[PDB]
Each structure stands twice: as C-alpha cells, then as structure tokens.
Coordinates of C-alpha atoms (C1' of nucleotides) and ligand atoms in Angstrom, one line a residue:
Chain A
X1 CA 13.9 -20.8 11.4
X2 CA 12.2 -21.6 8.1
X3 CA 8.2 -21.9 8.5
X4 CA 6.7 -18.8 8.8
X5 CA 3.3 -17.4 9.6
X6 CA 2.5 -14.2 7.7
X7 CA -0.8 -11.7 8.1
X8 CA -1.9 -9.2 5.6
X9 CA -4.2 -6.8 7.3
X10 CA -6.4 -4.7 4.5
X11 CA -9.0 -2.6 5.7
X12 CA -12.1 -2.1 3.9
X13 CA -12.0 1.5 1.6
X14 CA -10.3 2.9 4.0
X15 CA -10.8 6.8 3.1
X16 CA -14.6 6.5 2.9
X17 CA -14.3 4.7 6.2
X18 CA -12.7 7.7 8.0
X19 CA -15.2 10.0 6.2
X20 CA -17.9 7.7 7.5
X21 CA -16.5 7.9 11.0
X22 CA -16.4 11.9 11.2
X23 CA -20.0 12.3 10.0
X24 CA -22.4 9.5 10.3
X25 CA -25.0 10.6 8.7
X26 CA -23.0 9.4 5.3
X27 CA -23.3 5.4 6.7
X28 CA -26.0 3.8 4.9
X29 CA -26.0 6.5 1.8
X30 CA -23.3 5.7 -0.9
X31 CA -20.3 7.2 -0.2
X32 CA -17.8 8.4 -2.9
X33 CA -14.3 9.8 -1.2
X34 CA -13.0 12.4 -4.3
X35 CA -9.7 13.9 -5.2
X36 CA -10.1 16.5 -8.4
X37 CA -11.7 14.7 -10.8
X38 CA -12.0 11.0 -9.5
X39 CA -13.5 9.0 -7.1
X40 CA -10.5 7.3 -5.4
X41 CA -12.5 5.0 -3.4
X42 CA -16.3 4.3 -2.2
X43 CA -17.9 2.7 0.5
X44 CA -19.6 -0.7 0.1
X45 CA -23.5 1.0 -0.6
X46 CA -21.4 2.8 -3.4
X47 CA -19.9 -0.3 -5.3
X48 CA -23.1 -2.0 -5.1
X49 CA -24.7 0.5 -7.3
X50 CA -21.9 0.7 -9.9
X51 CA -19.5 3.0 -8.5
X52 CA -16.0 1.4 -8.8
X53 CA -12.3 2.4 -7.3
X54 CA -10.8 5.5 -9.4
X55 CA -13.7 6.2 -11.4
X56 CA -14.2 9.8 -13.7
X57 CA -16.8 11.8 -10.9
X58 CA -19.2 12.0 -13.9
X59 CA -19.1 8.4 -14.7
X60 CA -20.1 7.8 -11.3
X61 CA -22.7 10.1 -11.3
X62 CA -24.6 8.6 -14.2
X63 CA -24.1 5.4 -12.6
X64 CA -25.4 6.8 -9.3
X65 CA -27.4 9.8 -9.9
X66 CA -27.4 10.2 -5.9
X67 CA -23.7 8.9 -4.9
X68 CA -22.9 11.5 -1.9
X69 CA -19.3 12.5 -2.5
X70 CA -16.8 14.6 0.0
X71 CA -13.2 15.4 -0.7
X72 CA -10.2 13.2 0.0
X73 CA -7.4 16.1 -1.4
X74 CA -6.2 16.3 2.1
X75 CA -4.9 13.5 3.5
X76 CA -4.3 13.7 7.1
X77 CA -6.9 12.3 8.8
X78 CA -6.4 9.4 6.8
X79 CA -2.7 9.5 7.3
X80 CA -3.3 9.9 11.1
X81 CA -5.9 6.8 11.0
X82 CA -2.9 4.8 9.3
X83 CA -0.5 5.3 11.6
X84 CA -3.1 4.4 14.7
X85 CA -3.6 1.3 13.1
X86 CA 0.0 0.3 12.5
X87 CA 0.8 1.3 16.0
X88 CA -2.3 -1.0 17.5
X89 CA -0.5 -4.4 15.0
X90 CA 3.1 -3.0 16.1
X91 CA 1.3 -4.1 20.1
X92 CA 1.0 -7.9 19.1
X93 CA 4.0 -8.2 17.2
X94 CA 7.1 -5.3 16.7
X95 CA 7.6 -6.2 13.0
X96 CA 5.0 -4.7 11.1
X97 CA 5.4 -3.4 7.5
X98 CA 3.5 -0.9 6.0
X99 CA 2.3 -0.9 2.2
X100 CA 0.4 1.9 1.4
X101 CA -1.9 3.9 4.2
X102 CA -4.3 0.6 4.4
X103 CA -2.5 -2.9 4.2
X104 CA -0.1 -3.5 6.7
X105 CA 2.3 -7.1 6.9
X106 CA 2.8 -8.6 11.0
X107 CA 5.3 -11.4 10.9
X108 CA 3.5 -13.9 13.8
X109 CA 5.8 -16.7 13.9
X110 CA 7.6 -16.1 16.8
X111 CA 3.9 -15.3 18.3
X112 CA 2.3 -18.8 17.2
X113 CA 5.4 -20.4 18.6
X114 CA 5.0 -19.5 22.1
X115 CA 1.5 -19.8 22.3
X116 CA 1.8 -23.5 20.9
X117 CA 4.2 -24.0 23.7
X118 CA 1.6 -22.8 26.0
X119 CA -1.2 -25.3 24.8
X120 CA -0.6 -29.0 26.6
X121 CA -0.5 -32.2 25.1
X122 CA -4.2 -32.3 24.8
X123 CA -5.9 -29.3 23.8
X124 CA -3.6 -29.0 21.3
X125 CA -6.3 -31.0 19.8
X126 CA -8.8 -28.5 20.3
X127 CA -7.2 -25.9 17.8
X128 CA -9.6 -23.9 15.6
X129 CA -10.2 -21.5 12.9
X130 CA -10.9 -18.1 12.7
X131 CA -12.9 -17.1 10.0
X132 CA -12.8 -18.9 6.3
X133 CA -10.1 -21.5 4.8
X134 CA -9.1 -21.0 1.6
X135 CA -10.7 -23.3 -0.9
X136 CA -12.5 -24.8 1.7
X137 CA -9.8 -27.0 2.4
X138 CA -9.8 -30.0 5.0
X139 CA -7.8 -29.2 8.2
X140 CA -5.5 -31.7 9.7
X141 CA -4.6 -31.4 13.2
X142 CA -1.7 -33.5 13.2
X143 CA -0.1 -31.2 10.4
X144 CA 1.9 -29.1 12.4
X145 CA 1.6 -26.2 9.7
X146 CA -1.7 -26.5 9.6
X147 CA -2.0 -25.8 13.7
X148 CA 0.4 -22.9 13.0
X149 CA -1.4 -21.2 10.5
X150 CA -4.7 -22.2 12.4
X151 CA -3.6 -20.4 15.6
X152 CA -2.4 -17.6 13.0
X153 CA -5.7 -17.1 12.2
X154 CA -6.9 -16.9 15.3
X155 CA -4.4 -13.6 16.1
X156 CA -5.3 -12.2 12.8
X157 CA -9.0 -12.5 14.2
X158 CA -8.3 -11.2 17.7
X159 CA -6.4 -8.2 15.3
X160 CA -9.3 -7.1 13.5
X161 CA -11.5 -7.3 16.8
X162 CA -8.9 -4.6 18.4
X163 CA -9.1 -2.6 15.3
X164 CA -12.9 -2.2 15.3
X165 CA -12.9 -2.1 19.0
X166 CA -10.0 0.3 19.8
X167 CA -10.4 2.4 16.3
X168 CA -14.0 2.1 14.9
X169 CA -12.3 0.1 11.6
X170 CA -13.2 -2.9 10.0
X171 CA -11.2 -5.3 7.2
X172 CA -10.0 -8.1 6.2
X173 CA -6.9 -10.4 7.1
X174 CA -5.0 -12.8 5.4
X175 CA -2.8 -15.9 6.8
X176 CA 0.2 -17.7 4.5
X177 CA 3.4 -18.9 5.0
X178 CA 4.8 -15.5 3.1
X179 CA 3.9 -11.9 2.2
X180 CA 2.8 -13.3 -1.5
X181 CA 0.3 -15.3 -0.5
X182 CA -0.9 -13.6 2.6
X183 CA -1.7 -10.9 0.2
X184 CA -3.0 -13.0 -2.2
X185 CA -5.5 -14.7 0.3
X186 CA -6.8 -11.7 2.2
X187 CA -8.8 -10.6 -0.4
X188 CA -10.7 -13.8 -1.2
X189 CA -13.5 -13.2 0.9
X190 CA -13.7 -9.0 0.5
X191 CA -15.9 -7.2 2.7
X192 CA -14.6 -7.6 6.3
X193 CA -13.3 -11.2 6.5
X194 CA -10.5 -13.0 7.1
X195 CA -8.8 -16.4 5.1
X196 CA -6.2 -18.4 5.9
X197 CA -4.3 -20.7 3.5
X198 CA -3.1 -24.1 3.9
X199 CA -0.3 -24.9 2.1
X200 CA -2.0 -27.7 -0.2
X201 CA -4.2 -24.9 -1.5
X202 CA -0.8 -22.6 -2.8
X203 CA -0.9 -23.6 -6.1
X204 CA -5.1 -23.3 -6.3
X205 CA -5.2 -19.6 -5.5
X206 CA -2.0 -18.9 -7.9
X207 CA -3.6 -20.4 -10.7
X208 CA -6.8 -18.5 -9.3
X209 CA -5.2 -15.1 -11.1
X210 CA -6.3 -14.6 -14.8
X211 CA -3.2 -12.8 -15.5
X212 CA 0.5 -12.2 -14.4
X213 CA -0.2 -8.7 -14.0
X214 CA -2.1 -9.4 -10.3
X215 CA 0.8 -10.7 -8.7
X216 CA 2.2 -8.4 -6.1
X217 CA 5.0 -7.7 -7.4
X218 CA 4.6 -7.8 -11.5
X219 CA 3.8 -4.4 -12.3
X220 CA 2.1 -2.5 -15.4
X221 CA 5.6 -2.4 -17.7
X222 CA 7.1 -6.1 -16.7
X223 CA 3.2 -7.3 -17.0
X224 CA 3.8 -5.9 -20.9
X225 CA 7.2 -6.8 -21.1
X226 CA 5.8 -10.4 -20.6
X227 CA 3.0 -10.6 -22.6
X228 CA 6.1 -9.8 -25.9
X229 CA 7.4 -13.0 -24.7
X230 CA 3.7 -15.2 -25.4
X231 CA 3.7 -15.0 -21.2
X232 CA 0.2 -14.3 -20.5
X233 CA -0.8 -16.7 -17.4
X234 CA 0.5 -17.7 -14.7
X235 CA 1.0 -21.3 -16.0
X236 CA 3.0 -20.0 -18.6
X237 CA 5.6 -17.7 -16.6
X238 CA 5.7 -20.9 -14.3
X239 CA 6.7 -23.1 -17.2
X240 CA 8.2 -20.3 -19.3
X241 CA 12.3 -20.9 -19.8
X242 CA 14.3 -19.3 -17.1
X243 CA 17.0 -18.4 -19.4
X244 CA 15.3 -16.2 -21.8
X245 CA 13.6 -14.8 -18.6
X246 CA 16.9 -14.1 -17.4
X247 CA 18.3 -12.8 -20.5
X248 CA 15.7 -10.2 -21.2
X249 CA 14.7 -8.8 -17.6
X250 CA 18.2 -9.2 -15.5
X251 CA 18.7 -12.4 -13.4
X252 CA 17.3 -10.5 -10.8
X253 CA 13.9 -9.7 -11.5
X254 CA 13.6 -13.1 -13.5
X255 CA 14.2 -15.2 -10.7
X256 CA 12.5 -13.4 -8.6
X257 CA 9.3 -13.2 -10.5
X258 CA 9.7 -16.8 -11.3
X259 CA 9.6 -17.9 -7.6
X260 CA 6.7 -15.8 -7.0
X261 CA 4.1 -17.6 -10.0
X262 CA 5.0 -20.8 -8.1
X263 CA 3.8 -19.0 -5.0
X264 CA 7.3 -18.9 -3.4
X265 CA 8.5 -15.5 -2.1
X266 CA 11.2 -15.6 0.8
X267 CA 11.3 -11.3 1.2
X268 CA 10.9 -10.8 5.3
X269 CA 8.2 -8.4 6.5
X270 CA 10.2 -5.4 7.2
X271 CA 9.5 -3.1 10.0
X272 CA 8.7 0.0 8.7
X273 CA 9.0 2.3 11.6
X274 CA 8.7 6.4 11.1
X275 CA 8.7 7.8 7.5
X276 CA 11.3 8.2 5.2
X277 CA 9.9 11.5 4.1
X278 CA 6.9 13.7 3.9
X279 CA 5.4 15.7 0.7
X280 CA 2.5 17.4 -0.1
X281 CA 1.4 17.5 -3.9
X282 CA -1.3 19.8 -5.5
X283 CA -2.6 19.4 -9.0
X284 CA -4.5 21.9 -11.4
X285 CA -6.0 22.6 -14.3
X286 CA -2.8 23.8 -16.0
X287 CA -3.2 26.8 -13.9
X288 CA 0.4 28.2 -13.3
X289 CA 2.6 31.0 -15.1
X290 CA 5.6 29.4 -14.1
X291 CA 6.2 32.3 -12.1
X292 CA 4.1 33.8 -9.3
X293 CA 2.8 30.9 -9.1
X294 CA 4.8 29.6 -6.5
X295 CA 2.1 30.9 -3.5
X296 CA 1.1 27.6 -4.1
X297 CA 4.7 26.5 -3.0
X298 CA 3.8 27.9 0.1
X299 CA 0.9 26.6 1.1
X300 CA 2.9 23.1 0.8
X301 CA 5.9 24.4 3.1
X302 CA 3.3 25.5 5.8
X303 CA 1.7 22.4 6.3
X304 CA 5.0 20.1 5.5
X305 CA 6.4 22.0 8.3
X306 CA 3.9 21.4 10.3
X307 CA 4.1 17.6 9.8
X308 CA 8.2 17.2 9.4
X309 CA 7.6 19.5 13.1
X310 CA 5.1 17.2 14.6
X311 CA 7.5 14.1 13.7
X312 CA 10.6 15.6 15.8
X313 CA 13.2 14.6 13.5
X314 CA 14.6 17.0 11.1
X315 CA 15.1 17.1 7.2
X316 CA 18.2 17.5 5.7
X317 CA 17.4 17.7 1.9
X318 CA 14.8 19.3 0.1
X319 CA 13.1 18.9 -3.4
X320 CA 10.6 20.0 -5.7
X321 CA 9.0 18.4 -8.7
X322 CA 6.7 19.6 -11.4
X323 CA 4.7 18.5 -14.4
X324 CA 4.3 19.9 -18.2
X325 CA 1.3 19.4 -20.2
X326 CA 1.3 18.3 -24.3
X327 CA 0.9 15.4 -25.4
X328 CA 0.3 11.9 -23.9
X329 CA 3.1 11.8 -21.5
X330 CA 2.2 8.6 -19.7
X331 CA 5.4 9.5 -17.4
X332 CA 6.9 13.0 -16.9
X333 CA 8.5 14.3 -13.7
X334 CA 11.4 16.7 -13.1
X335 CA 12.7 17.7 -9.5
X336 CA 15.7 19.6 -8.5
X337 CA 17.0 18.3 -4.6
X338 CA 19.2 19.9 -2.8
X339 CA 20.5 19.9 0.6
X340 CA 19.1 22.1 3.8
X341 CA 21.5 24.8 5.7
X342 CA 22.4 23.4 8.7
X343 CA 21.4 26.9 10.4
X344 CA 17.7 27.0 8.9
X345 CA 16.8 23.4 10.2
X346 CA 16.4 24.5 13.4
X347 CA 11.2 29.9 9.4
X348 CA 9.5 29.6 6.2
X349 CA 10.8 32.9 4.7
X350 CA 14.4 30.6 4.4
X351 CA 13.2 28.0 2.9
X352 CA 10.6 29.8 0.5
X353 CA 13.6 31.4 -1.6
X354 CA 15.0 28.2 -1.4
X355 CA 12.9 26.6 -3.1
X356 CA 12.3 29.4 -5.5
X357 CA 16.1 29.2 -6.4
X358 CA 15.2 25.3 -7.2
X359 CA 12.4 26.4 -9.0
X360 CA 13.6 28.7 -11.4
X361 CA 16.8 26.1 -12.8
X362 CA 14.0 24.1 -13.9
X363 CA 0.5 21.4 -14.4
X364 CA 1.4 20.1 -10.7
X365 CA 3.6 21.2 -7.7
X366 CA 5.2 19.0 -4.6
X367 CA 7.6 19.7 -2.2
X368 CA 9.2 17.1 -0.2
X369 CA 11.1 16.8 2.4
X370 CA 13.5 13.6 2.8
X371 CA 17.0 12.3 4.0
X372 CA 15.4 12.4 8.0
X373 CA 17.7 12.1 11.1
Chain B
dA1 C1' 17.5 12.5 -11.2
dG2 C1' 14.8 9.2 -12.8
dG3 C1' 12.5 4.7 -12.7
dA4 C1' 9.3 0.8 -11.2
dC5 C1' 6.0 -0.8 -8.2
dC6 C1' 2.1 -0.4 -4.7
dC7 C1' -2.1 1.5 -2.4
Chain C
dT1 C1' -5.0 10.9 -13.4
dG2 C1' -2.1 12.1 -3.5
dG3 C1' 1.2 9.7 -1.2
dG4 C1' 5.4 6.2 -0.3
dT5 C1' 9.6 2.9 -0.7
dC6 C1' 13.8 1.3 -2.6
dC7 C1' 16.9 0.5 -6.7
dT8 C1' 19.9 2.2 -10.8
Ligands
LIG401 N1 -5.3 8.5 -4.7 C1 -5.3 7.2 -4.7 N2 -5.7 6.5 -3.7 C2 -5.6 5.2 -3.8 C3 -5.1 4.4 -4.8 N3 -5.1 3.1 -4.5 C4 -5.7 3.1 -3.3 N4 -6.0 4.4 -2.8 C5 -6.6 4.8 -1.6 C6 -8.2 5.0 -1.5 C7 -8.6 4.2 -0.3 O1 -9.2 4.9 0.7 C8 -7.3 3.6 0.3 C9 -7.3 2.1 0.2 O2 -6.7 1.5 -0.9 P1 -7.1 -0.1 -1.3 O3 -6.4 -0.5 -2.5 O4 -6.9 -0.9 -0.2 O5 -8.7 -0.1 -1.6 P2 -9.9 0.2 -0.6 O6 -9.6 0.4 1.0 O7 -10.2 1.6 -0.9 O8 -11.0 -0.8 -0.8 P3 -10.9 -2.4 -0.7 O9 -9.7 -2.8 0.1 O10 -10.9 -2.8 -2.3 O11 -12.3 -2.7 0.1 O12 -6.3 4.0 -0.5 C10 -4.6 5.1 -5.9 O13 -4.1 4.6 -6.9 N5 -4.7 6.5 -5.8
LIG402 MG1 -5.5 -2.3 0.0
LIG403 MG1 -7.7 -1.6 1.6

DNA sequence: AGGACCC
DNA sequence: TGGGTCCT
C-alpha cells in the first residue's frame, strides 16, 4: 500500500440538470434553478449569457432579460438524484465519499490493481487514455504510475458513461494520486470531461491557483488569516516558515495545509454510507412573531418525518435553530438539542410541543433530526 | 452549542 | 444569502 488512484466525479450544475430532466422543454433555453432570492446554479445556455453561480435573481435578469428560472427551495428530487448516483459509483468500487449532493470521491486502486493483473505481458503496452491529460503531458508506458492512473482513467470514463446511460447525467471526472488533486484536476476541462494527472504535472496545476483560498481545504477565514501573514500564493505558503505557521494556526491545521500547497494530501476517501442526519430549513423575509409562528415548525416535522421514515433508522436527538436580524451578522445561529423519548420514536402532535418547549428557552427556522441508529 | 469548511 | 460533515 502506498500509490493510490483517486476519482473526483462532479457533475455538471447538477440542480438545473434535474430540472432539465423533469421538463424538457427547458433544454436548449437558459435555465436558472432559484432559491428565494438567488440563482443557485444555471445550466450551460445560462452561463454563456452572463448568468453566474449564486447570482441576485435581478442581476441575472438584466444580464439575461429571458433566463427561464424554476424553484430549487425543495430539495428532494435533487437529493434523490444524489443518492442514485452514489449508489451507481458504490457498484464499481464500495468506498465512495460524498461531498456535497454533486461531487462524489471512489478510491480505484484496488480496482486498477486487478485489472493490471489481468492484462498480459504484452498488451500491457497497449494502455490508453480516457479523455484529456493534464497539461498535455507526455505518457510513458513504462512508468508504472503512469499505466495506473491511465487505466484510472479509463474507469472514471466507463463511470460517467453509466451515469448518462443508467441516470440521464452528464459531468466531469478527475484522476490523481489523492483527493487534493483529483479535485483539483476534474475541473480543468469543465463542461462534461474528464482529466487525469500525471504526477510530473502536480506542481503545474498547484501553482495553476491564483490564490490560497482555492485549495480544498483552505477556507474563507484561514484564506484571511493567511493573507495577515504576507501569504497570498501558493508559492508563498509553500515556502512560508513552518513554525510561525504552526504557531499561529495550531500544528494541526499548519501542517496540514502546508502538505496540501505542495500538492500532498494523505486523508483516505471515506465511505460515506447513509446520513448522519436530516433537516429541513425555511427562510423569510423577517416574517415571524416569535410566536405562532411555529406552523412553520410544522410543515418541517411533516416532511422530516417523512424522510427520517423512508430511511428506517430512527432519530434519537432533536434540535432547532433560528436566526435574528440587525446588523451585519456575517455568522449568527442559536439551536437548543435535546434528546427524543424513547416511547415517541416509534406522531407529530409529540414532537410538535417538543419542539415548542425548545423554542420558547430561546428570520429563519430548521429542524433537524440527528444522532441516527 | 458553536465553529469551520464544502457544495 | 438549503443542506451536510466533523472537530472543539
Ligand atoms: N444553495 C446552494 N447550492 C449550492 C452551493 N454550492 C453549490 N450548490 C448547488 C447548486 C448546484 O445544483 C449543485 C452543484 O454544486 P457545484 O459546486 O458542483 O456547481 P454546479 O453543479 O452547479 O456547476 P459546475 O460543477 O460549476 O458545472 O449544488 C451553495 O453555496 N448554496
Ligand atoms: Mg461541484
Ligand atoms: Mg458539480
């Protein structure tokens, strides 16, 4: 154990997609997929005209006086779509990770492994690639990586033709020796493509990022905790000291963030498996007395246990969170969990007051229901 | 309970 | 700015 062969499958705006699928008429015609305000995603018509990802409804509008939109609010279709696709990846390989309803991580090196074993001592030769290599890069077919990442690509293809096949979806794929740079490369060539990347080529694509901020894994405060230090790119976090690093963001997330602008990250694709919870959120114009207004709380309950039904495990804590508008609070949750009687697990009336009782010790609303078994 | 990060 | 995961 020690080489590995890593695929990042991203499908292409995957809400608009589903929309697309249910009515076809939308194909062709810019698509916007909305949530209140915003235009979470678009389809590829859509982005050609202007129309970017999370963009105000209005300012998408005078960009695209014609962009058909449709509401994305509710999210199971799209949830059920997500979970089809892991299920189809789970078929070629068990370990599959989930990250967000569109990018799922398939760990294929036990796969390549036996179908190199399979190959004889001649058309071993013969190896190919699927789709593009990143920065064009020369293949050698005595470099034993390069064959394994080659025949990578070649499942990562034979993925994305079950996808469309089997489930109507197109995206793209990306093959690496880790999650970092399978992530990384799958979005070099965007719509509907795949990449793999040769190991020679690592340190091209890192140094392909503008900023620190794009590494998976660097979010929006370390990003700014970073930039205080004169660590803008990722040359500089690569030759930045490791010691004041250290010092100033925990040994942990230094080193760790250190490996990854060199391109090294050793975190194994985890199988992700059912849910660890389900909630339903529901945000509005300020609209809610504090009291009375917990109808709304129902309406979550009675599809939440609908879904945390459907699964067939059962919940064994619930919890509630809210919001309070003012100022610019650019983070400002509150949520009061508690556990669920034993009796009323295995109905709403219960659990309403429940959560009432919850409410009452403490501009949106979300149950959730966690701590499965 | 709250925080950080991600899609 | 509709959901999730895991760490402090
Ligand atoms: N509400 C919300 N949805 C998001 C966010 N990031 C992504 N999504 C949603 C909208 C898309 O249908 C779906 C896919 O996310 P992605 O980051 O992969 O982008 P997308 O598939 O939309 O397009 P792309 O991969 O760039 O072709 O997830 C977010 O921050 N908020
Ligand atoms: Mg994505
Ligand atoms: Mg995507």
């Amino acid at each position: 154990a020690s080489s590995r062969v890593i695929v990042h499958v991203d499908l292409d705006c995957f809400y608009a997609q589903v929309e697309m699928i249910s009515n076809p008429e939308l194909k062709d015609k810019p698509l916007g997929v909305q949530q209140k305000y915003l235009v979470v995603t678009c389809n590829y018509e859509a982005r050609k005209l202007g129309v970017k990802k999370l963009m105000n409804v209005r300012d998408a509008k005078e960009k695209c006086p014609q962009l058909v939109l449709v509401n994305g609010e509710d999210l199971t279709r799209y949830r059920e779509m997500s979970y089809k696709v892991t299920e189809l990846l789970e078929e070629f390989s068990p370990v599959v990770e989930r990250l967000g309803f569109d990018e799922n991580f398939v760990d294929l090196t036990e796969m390549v492994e036996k179908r190199l074993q399979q190959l004889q001592s001649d058309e071993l030769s013969a190896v190919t690639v699927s789709g593009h290599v990143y920065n064009n890069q020369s293949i050698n077919l005595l470099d034993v990586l390069h064959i394994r990442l080659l025949v990578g690509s070649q499942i990562a293809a034979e993925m994305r033709e079950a996808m469309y096949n089997q489930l109507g979806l197109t995206g793209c794929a990306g093959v690496a020796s880790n999650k970092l740079l399978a992530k990384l490369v799958s979005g070099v060539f965007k719509p509907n493509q795949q990449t793999v990347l040769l190991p020679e080529s690592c340190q091209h694509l890192i140094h392909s990022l503008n900023h620190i901020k794009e590494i998976p894994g660097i979010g929006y405060k370390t990003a700014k905790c970073l930039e205080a230090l004169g660590i803008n790119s990722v040359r500089d976090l690569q030759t930045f000291s490791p010691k004041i690093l250290e010092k100033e963001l925990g040994i942990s997330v230094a080193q760790r963030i250190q490996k990854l602008s060199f391109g090294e990250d050793n975190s194994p694709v985890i199988l992700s498996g059912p849910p660890q919870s389900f909630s339903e959120e529901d945000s509005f114009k300020k609209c809610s007395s504090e009291v009375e207004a917990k109808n709304k709380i129902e309406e979550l309950l009675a599809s939440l246990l609908n879904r945390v039904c459907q699964d067939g495990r059962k919940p064994h804590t619930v919890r509630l969170i809210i919001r309070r508008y003012s100022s610019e609070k650019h983070y400002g949750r509150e949520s009061r969990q508690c556990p669920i009687p034993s009796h009323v697990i295995q109905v709403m009336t219960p659990m309403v007051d429940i959560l009432m009782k919850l409410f009452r010790n403490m501009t949106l609303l979300s149950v959730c229901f966690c701590n499965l078994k």
